[PDB]
Amino acid sequence: AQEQRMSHHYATIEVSQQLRQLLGDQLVILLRETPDGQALERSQNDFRRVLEQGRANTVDSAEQAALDGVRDAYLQLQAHTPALLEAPMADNDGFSEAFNGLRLRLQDLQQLALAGISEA
Amino acid sequence: SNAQEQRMSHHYATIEVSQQLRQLLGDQLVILLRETPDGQALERSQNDFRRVLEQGRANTVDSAEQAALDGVRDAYLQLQAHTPALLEAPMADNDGFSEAFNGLRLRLQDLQQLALAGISEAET
């Protein structure tokens, strides 16, 4: 029974990693000199998709409720996003690219450590 | 046995370093997304990120994880090099996006901690 709780919790961990990556993707776009609204649209649709997939197959009350909380907060973020497109945030892509570089390395470090735990 | 337990401890430790660094990076973004970023708050957050990172570089037993942290260090110095532009020419019109981003990233951090706990427990 411990292993069955395990694979379920790992799926949830993967959902949370995908959502964090997608939020990161959106921030990278929004921080560019000239954000691409269609890229932003795709990334938002992707976030909602991963969240809904996750909500539909999580069979654990605490994690269902956490996902509901993520949805609630995400809808608010989405509502404030157009004001960032309408008026860009940077004079060049410097910060966006530096941010992207760092956050990818941090994501990779977490995944590397998670791996060390799995195969053990 | 005992060995494996020590290894788990090591990996979970790196997970926590990475969680802390991600939270601290998020703190800096929350500040920079504000209409009037507080430079002093940002400096304190930068100092904390460096401290956590440097302790991690010194204390991380797994060789691959330690190497990864050098990569994080390199990328962080690049982020710092590009930070004054956003600090000194803030272009956000209000705090809406910043506050909403903070709310969301905290809920995501909560989701991840909850999932990790489930893995931790099922691993015993």
Method used to obtain the model:
X-ray
Euclidean distance between CA atoms A74 and A20, whole angstroms: 11
Q: Which residues of A touch B72 (CB under 8 A)?
A: 102, 105-106, 109
Q: Which residues of A touch B92 (CB under 8 A)?
A: 84, 89
Place of tokens 């973004």: B29
Residue B88, C-beta contacts closer than 8 angstroms, at least 6 positions apart: none
Provide the 8-state DSSP code for A103.
Answer: H
Nearest 5°: phi and psi at A33? -60, -40
Q: Which residues of A touch B1 (CB under 8 A)?
A: none
Contact of B52 with chain A, judged by CB distance below 8 Å, is answered with no
Euclidean distance between CA atoms B46 and B76, whole angstroms: 10
Which structure tokens are listed for B77? 């110095």
Amino acid letter at A71? R
Are B96 and A83 in contact by the 8 Å Cβ rule? The answer is yes
Give the angle subtended at the CA of A18 by the CAs of B49 and A112, to the nearest 5°. Answer: 55
Are A55 and A64 in contact by the 8 Å Cβ rule? The answer is yes
C-alpha closest to that of B52 among B22, B9, B82, B92: B22
* CB-nearest partner of B12 from A72, A97, A117: A117
Are A101 and A81 in contact by the 8 Å Cβ rule? The answer is no
Cβ atoms within 10 Å, residue B40: 9
Nearest 5°: phi and psi at B69? -70, -30
Mutate to test the interface with A, among B104, B116, B123, B124 (most CBs of A within 10 A): B104
Amino acid letter at A9? H
Domain interval for residue B26: 1-124
Which structure tokens are listed for A112? 């590397």
CATH number at residue B106: 1.20.120.880
C-alpha closest to that of B31 among B112, B114, B90, B107: B90
Integer CA distances (angstroms), B11 to B50, B76, B124, in order: 20, 22, 15
Q: What share of chain A is helix, strand, coil (3-state, %, to 5)?
A: 80, 0, 20
Chain mean position to CA A36: 18
Angle between the A94-118 and A2-30 helix axes, to the nearest 10 degrees?
170
Provide the 8-state DSSP code for A31.
Answer: T
Number of domains in chain B: 1
3-state secondary structure chain B: CHHHHHHHHHHHHHHHHHHHHHHHHHHHHHHHCCCCCCHHHHHHHHHHHHHHHHHHHHHCCCHHHHHHHHHHHHHHHHHHHHHHHHHHCCCCCCCHHHHHHHHHHHHHHHHHHHHHHHHHHHCC
* CB-nearest partner of A66 from B10, B83, B114: B114
